[PDB]
């Protein structure tokens, strides 16, 4: 078995020549060679199975990943794992090979404004796509959108993403800290704004310590919220914490970003909404001028139906939600069903 700083990659004879390119909180990638397809290919390693909500990660994004096909979402080729359940402790998912991701661009690049928009253009094309199978990416950030050589953008990480039915904290939208309850596709257009000012600017645009941190960056920015704003916080106790902050003035986006696109900043004021009702849409957002040298809407295609994972996993023993991963990748091994 090839082995990468002190791991075991058990992925031979068919992927060779790995070499390490990156690592998140549950996964070590690795690039390799498929010489049987005659392809470069990316190799994510991951180790679930003692923890429920590792094992929740993994289900959800293999389940996600193969139902979906776009150009803007990363695709699953392959997934190795043992041939019995008892042997079965790595799961390795094989995907298509990218050259870098856009936390790693930003820390050696300024981008120019085209840049900027094809970037946006690329994400918002893939996420329509997402929202259009009812799905929730909820965990949206420069690390888990990947690019090529050609500028390509593809999104990854689904292992957070959920049905829509109402690591890092910098992208979350204030109603996940405020209400833990009803998550809408809004929530996804408030990561993509973040995203959209840390491209303007290089620096994240709330980097909060932790929730009551990450809550007075936003505020400090947005200004205290607005009665409209504050009627749609379920949570009173929320509310009632809200209202206990000192008073805030927004700040302008052009204090912000004082030579960055107009256009931008209006796109970017429509997509840091507080409330999560008058936020801008994902296909309002393409549709947007910022983003007119690249709109074609017959050419962002949506998904043929909406998403299901037919059961619910949140409360689901770890040794069941192993049984379903085993299960969920028969279909690689050889003989199956
Ligand atoms: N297909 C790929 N091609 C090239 N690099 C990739 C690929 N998939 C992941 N990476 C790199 O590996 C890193 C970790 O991948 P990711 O899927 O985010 O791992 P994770 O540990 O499961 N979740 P997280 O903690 O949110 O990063 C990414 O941020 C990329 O730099
Ligand atoms: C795209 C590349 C790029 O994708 O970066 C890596 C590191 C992946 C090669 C750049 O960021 C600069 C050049 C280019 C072609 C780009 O942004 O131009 C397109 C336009 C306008």
Redesign the pocket.
Do not use: F, H, P, W
């Given at each position: 078995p090839e082995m990468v700083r002190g791991q075991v990659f058990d992925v031979g004879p068919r992927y060779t020549n790995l070499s390490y390119?990156?690592?998140?909180?549950?996964?070590?990638?690795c690039?390799a060679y498929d010489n049987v397809n005659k392809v470069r290919?990316?190799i994510?390693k991951?180790s679930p199975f003692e923890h429920q909500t590792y094992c929740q990660?993994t289900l959800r994004?293999i389940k996600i990943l193969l139902r979906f096909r776009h150009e803007n979402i990363?695709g699953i080729n392959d997934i190795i794992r043992a041939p019995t359940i008892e042997q079965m402790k790595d799961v390795y998912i094989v995907?298509?090979?990218?050259?870098?991701?856009l936390?790693?661009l930003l820390k050696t690049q300024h981008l120019s404004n085209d840049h900027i928009c094809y970037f946006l253009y690329q994400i918002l094309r893939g996420l329509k796509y997402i929202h259009s199978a009812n799905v929730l990416h909820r965990?949206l950030?420069p690390?888990?959108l990947?690019l090529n050589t050609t500028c390509d953008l593809?999104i990854?990480?689904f292992?957070?993403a959920r049905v829509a039915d109402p690591?890092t904290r910098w992208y979350r939208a204030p109603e996940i800290m405020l209400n833990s309850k009803g998550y809408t596709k809004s929530i996804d257009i408030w990561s993509v704004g973040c995203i959209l000012a840390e491209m303007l600017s290089n620096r994240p645009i709330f980097p909060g310590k932790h929730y009551l941190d990450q809550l007075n960056h936003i505020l400090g920015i947005l200004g205290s919220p607005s009665q409209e704003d504050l009627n749609c916080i379920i949570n009173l106790k929320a509310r009632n914490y809200l209202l206990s902050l000192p008073h805030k003035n927004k700040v302008p986006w052009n204090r912000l970003f004082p030579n960055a696109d107009s256009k931008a900043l209006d796109l970017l004021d429509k997509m840091l909404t507080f409330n999560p009702h008058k936020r801008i849409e994902v296909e309002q957002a393409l549709a947007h001028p910022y983003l007119e040298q690249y709109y074609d809407p017959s050419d962002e295609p949506i998904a043929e139906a909406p998403f299901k994972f037919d059961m619910e996993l949140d409360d689901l023993p770890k040794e069941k939600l192993k049984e379903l991963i085993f299960e969920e990748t028969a279909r690689f091994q050889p003989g199956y069903r």
């Open positions: 390119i990156g690592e998140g909180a549950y996964g070590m990638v690039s290919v990316a994510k991951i990660r994004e990363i995907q298509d090979l990218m050259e870098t991701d936390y790693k965990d950030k690390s888990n990947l593809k990854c990480d292992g957070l690591a």
